[PDB]
């Protein structure tokens, strides 16, 4: 009989532990695995897939209206949209990326936004998409927005613009959950020129917002989400 010593933690149940254990079904032979399309190895593979942003989550907006960003006629220098950038909250709370990230405490790495213009082929516009790093409020004017990271989008033949939002942080990781200290700043869009529709045409046109992780996107520590409850 080998002398042994027990240590603190003996017989504890730790839900994150990994140990070997006896099989309840000795010599069992599992059903052979066949090729099934769509195998997933990492959640980060999923995080890189674009999903829609319910950006127009305004009061009294219903149905699919939340995923439609209105653009209209003769607006110049006006704000199209804007939101404080949160990963596990705000307008991104219910996105795929958002929900995946709600399972993690910390997040680092760049994000991508993209916008699809769905208006008439004969229409045109130029939009400014801008990102304002932490340490400032707003922007409230295009003149402020242009001082951040931005792209001017020529809504022409190609319908989609991609804005890569860089990891503008002095902190290696930010919190997924809302946090003043590690806040990610703001995202906004302004009319660079204006929406122009064919003569005598008056209507609202829309664009769709999308979000995905960049290849450099990182998630650090798993946790439960706040997006589900049970009685």
């Amino acid at each position: 009989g080998l002398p042994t010593v027990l240590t603190p933690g003996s017989e504890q149940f730790l839900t994150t532990d990994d140990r070997q254990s006896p099989s309840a079904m000795p010599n069992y032979e599992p059903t052979p695995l066949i090729h099934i399309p769509g195998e997933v190895k990492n959640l980060l593979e999923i995080a890189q897939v674009d999903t829609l942003i319910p950006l127009n989550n305004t009061t009294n907006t219903t149905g699919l209206g939340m995923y439609r960003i209105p653009l209209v006629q003769n607006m110049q220098g006006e704000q199209v949209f804007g939101f404080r950038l949160y990963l596990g909250d705000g307008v991104l709370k219910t996105t795929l990326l958002g929900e995946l990230c709600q399972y993690f405490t910390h997040w680092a790495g760049s994000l991508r936004l993209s916008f699809m213009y769905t208006g008439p082929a004969l229409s045109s516009a130029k939009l400014l998409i801008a990102y304002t790093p932490p340490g400032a409020q707003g922007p409230t004017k295009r003149k402020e927005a242009m001082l951040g990271t931005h792209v001017v989008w020529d809504i022409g033949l190609q319908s989609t613009v991609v804005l890569n939002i860089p990891w503008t942080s002095g902190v290696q990781y930010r919190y997924t959950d809302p946090d003043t200290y590690t806040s990610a700043g703001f995202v906004s869009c302004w009319y660079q020129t204006s929406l122009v529709l064919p003569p005598q045409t008056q209507q609202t046109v829309y664009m769709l917002g999308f979000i995905s992780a960049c290849p450099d996107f990182k998630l650090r520590l798993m946790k439960d989400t706040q997006s589900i409850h049970q009685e």
Partner: protein
């Protein structure tokens, strides 16, 4: 081994190690051999005891909570009545540890926790009960239980620990950042606003640890105190600083009494031995 001192005989010279200028900020090393004649002798010492690792590597009580086994009362939240008790993690609570950590500006380590529960029955209980205690780690942004038996306790993604009263749990927690080192002090704010809170409380987002008595209500109230101990591992620290002299008032603050007691004891005269 190495020498503590090297034989040195009387000197009469131009070199004078005994004179310097502290104005430079230097504390140039000198030895007894610079002031007096000396015998050669060995250190017989490695300094192992004084390593940072050994200094901050001893377990210390961090926090004590109390939870009970009691029939829920309709008029009180399960936090008002201690059926469940969520500790916000902060090593500053029990100040002996706090000082040892405050001696450095930046500290990095992995943590090891030991959790010990003890029950008591101050009432007319007819028998003891080795209650099962659950601890759940709740990272920032994770759901905070509302009820002792809430869905949150499923711990689908939250690390959790189960142990019995009289037993203990032990586990390691890797350095949680988010920075490259933990800050003991923070001379700043969460953001640029006059009314924003000042100090390390800004950065202390280690989440919280929820405790629960797993067992259903018995026929009497049982009180369980849970003591959490912490030990650092693989410890690195930067920028040492002078240890606090005055009594601490509140967690995360360097505040002290408006009329503090001078730490320095006095004597009748500078000439008193």
């Amino acid at each position: 081994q190495t020498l503590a001192s090297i034989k040195s005989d009387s000197k009469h010279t131009q070199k004078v190690p005994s004179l310097t200028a502290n104005e430079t900020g230097a504390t140039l090393p000198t030895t007894p051999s610079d002031s007096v004649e000396t015998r050669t002798t060995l250190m017989h010492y490695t300094g192992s005891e004084t390593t940072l690792e050994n200094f901050l590597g001893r377990a210390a009580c961090v926090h004590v909570v109390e939870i009970v086994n009691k029939r829920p009362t309709d008029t009180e939240e399960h936090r008002m009545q201690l059926l469940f008790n969520n500790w916000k993690i902060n090593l500053s609570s029990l100040v002996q540890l706090r000082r040892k950590l405050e001696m450095f500006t930046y500290v990095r380590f992995d943590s090891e926790y030991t959790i010990i529960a003890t029950s008591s029955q101050p009432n007319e209980a007819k028998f003891s009960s080795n209650l099962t205690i659950q601890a759940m780690f709740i990272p920032p942004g994770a759901p905070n239980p509302k009820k002792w038996d809430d869905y949150t306790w499923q711990s689908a993604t939250n690390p959790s620990v189960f142990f019995n009263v009289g037993k203990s749990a032990r586990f390691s927690v890797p350095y949680l950042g988010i920075a490259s080192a933990y800050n003991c002090f923070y001379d700043g704010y969460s953001h640029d606003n006059s009314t924003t809170p000042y100090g390390i409380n800004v950065l202390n987002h280690m989440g919280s640890m929820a405790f629960r008595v797993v067992n259903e209500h018995d026929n009497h109230t049982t009180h369980v105190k849970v003591r959490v101990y912490h030990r650092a591992k693989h410890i690195r620290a930067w920028v040492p600083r002078a240890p606090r002299a005055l009594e601490y008032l509140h967690i995360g603050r360097t505040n002290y009494k408006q009329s503090p007691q001078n730490p320095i004891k006095t004597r009748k005269t500078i000439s008193t031995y």
